[PDB]
Amino acid sequence: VSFLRTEDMVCLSCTATGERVCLAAEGFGNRHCFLENIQDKNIPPDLSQCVFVIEQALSVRALQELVTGHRTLLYGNAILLRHLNSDMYLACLSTSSSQDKLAFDVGLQEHSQGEACWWTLHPASKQRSEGEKVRVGDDLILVSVATERYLHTTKENEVSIVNASFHVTHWSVQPYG
């Protein structure tokens, strides 16, 4: 219904230093992620480089077996986000190139093998709890399965970056069309 379902085209937005921004990526040459300022730019759904597809959604138990059909998303599920323009998957890179030496970079990878490309959903407040259907527009938390870090944005050098950090960021998922 009004929830996130598999195969949805969605944008992930938050607010870094007041501004509202969307998670974006280029693809072909550049494998790193970046943020787009959507602060009153367009509607909640922003432009092209901002579109990801919820390709798959597994339960905690399903993830184990799968590692070694419009499912609705449940808080606690592990999702797989494919960038539309590039057909690559949002993942946690092994390189740390931000000021925070403990954060890892988030970018794209060609294949969905291993844990680096999986992210579990978790509620941002107490208005939702594990097992519930994830409602569109809900503020949620994105946890890397591989690094045990949060999908995180922070301004460093007057620009909004995105990385995988021990510090949390609340993300809103708005679908397209």
Tab-separated table of N, CA, C and O in Angstrom, residues 25-31 83-88 108:
chain	number	residue	atom	x	y	z
A	25	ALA	N	24.917	9.238	-6.881
A	25	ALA	CA	26.136	8.629	-7.389
A	25	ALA	C	26.159	8.806	-8.896
A	25	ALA	O	25.116	8.977	-9.532
A	26	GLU	N	27.364	8.783	-9.461
A	26	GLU	CA	27.499	8.957	-10.903
A	26	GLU	C	27.528	7.611	-11.613
A	26	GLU	O	26.702	7.346	-12.494
A	27	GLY	N	28.458	6.743	-11.231
A	27	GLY	CA	28.435	5.439	-11.839
A	27	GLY	C	29.687	5.039	-12.582
A	27	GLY	O	30.580	4.388	-12.035
A	28	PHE	N	29.752	5.431	-13.845
A	28	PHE	CA	30.677	4.838	-14.795
A	28	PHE	C	32.131	5.118	-14.447
A	28	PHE	O	32.864	4.200	-14.071
A	29	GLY	N	32.573	6.362	-14.555
A	29	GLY	CA	33.922	6.669	-14.114
A	29	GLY	C	34.052	6.635	-12.601
A	29	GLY	O	34.910	5.941	-12.048
A	30	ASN	N	33.187	7.379	-11.918
A	30	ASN	CA	33.258	7.627	-10.486
A	30	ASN	C	32.383	6.668	-9.684
A	30	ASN	O	31.158	6.646	-9.849
A	31	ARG	N	33.017	5.881	-8.812
A	31	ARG	CA	32.315	4.891	-8.003
A	31	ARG	C	31.927	5.397	-6.615
A	31	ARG	O	31.239	4.679	-5.886
A	83	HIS	N	21.728	1.386	-7.899
A	83	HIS	CA	21.666	2.691	-8.538
A	83	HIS	C	21.134	2.535	-9.961
A	83	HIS	O	21.643	1.724	-10.741
A	84	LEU	N	20.086	3.291	-10.293
A	84	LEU	CA	19.408	3.094	-11.573
A	84	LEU	C	20.325	3.384	-12.753
A	84	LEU	O	20.487	2.543	-13.645
A	85	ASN	N	20.954	4.563	-12.766
A	85	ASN	CA	21.744	4.978	-13.925
A	85	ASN	C	22.878	4.009	-14.238
A	85	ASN	O	23.226	3.823	-15.410
A	86	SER	N	23.477	3.398	-13.216
A	86	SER	CA	24.688	2.618	-13.411
A	86	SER	C	24.488	1.118	-13.299
A	86	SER	O	25.350	0.366	-13.763
A	87	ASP	N	23.383	0.662	-12.713
A	87	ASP	CA	23.140	-0.760	-12.513
A	87	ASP	C	24.111	-1.377	-11.518
A	87	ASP	O	24.263	-2.599	-11.477
A	88	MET	N	24.803	-0.552	-10.742
A	88	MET	CA	25.656	-1.005	-9.651
A	88	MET	C	24.934	-0.842	-8.316
A	88	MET	O	23.881	-0.208	-8.223
A	108	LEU	N	29.763	2.539	-5.031
A	108	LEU	CA	29.103	1.540	-5.846
A	108	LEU	C	30.046	0.377	-6.088
A	108	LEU	O	31.267	0.551	-6.125
